[PDB]
Design a protein around this ligand. Structure first.
Ligand SMILES: [Cl-]
Ligand SMILES: [Cl-]
Length: 272
């Protein structure tokens, strides 16, 4: 992995991002969920790099990246991604993928950096903003995580993140996810929670998209259910919708081979 100071149009103008960059060819940048880190996408990075260039950053405030206290808007996160691609000399088009919060970042990127997208991969996410109660709950999470750390978040989220089959067959995957949460920087988690609260409604962005889009969801996703994701996909032109069996909210970790395959086969067409 690498750690580089990049120039970003978001405050504070410069930020240090940690990231993986593996393979050659078409660039595919994959964005993790909340409150996880780049290792969420490790199986896909390690497998897809035989055919594509896979770039996987820790977002601001997560993993090994710089923590910028206050609010980390989805726009700011997207600006950082643009600045990373600029740093790397990927100044043309990329495929951008994101899971959950990372999908919110992808929407912010598509808003602002349309002409940099060859394609979008939207996993286990939604285009609607937070409801008023959801916003308030973000503020409560932010306030508490700054003081107590993310243990309470792991306790609340783990049962909602993965399906029953994962708990049974892959307890090691559960534990990897738990350690990602437990290790997340408290002020980075707070800043992202506040950023999620403030994110705009992307509903009307979707019909205006101009690149092919893959929409992927776990069969048993409790957080962004498949029914709602299918409806979201029907608003996106040039979309493909895939349900990953025997996965909850984290298909890349729960069913890594099936996710890698779905992405690989879709990328081949974007690419050809
Ligand atoms: Cl957003
Ligand atoms: Cl909501």
């Amino acid at each position: 992995a690498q750690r580089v100071k990049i120039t970003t149009t978001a405050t504070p103008g410069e930020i240090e991002l940690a990231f993986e960059d593996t393979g050659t060819g078409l660039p595919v940048l994959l964005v993790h969920g909340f409150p996880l880190d780049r290792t969420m996408w490790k199986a896909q990075r390690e497998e897809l790099c035989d055919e594509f260039r896979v770039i996987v950053p820790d977002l601001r405030g997560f993993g090994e990246s710089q923590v910028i206290p206050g609010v980390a808007t989805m726009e700011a996160m997207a600006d950082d991604l643009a600045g990373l691609c600029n740093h790397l000399g990927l100044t043309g088009k990329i495929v951008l993928g994101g899971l959950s919060m990372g999908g919110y970042v992808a929407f912010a990127f598509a808003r602002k950096y349309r002409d940099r997208l060859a394609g979008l991969i939207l996993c286990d996410t939604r285009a609607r903003p937070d409801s008023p109660e959801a916003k308030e709950n973000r503020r409560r999470v932010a306030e508490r995580v700054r003081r107590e750390g993310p243990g309470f978040i792991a306790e609340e989220m783990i049962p909602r993140l993965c399906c029953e089959s994962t708990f049974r067959n892959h307890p090691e995957v559960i534990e990897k996810i738990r350690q990602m949460i437990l290790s997340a920087p408290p002020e980075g988690v707070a800043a992202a929670a506040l950023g999620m609260a403030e994110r705009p409604d992307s509903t009307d962005l979707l019909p205006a998209l101009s690149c092919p889009t893959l929409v992927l969801v776990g069969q048993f996703d409790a957080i962004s259910p498949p029914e709602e994701m299918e409806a979201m996909a029907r608003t996106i032109p040039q979309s493909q919708f895939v349900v990953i069996p025997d996965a909850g909210h984290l298909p890349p970790m729960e069913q890594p081979e099936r996710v890698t395959q779905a992405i690989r086969e879709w990328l081949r067409k974007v690419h050809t």
